[PDB]
Amino acid sequence: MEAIAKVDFKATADDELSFKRGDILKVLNEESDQNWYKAELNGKDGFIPKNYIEMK
Amino acid sequence: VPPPVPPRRR
């Protein structure tokens, strides 16, 4: 699927995906765990909180 | 209440 960033994720570690509120976060593989989705911004990829995006 | 960040998991 794909979902709209509701709050901005400001990552410290270069593995957790950093993104801004508004961005189109397209999901690659959430079929792993509900907590942290493996997704694609546009330019780069990483882990995204369920809470931070408009998943539903 | 702020939007929470889940634990990454070992």
Side-chain angles (χ1 to χ4, degrees):
Chain A
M1 64 75 161
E2 61 188 74
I4 294 67
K6 176 163 48 58
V7 48
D8 58 288
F9 192 87
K10 185 176 181 179
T12 301
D14 188 51
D15 55 358
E16 305 309 279
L17 184 60
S18 185
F19 57 91
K20 296 185 178 182
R21 64 211 305 140
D23 296 354
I24 302 177
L25 282 288
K26 184 162 190 65
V27 169
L28 303 183
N29 174 227
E30 59 177 288
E31 308 84 0
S32 179
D33 70 279
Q34 173 52 35
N35 302 99
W36 288 96
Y37 305 146
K38 297 182 302 308
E40 176 183 69
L41 210 175
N42 285 296
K44 73 189 191 305
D45 305 87
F47 298 93
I48 172 159
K50 61 180 171 61
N51 297 92
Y52 276 54
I53 86 194
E54 191 62 34
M55 57 175 173
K56 300 185 189 299
Chain B
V1 173
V5 177
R8 301 211 300 168
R9 202 188 306 94
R10 66 180 62 75

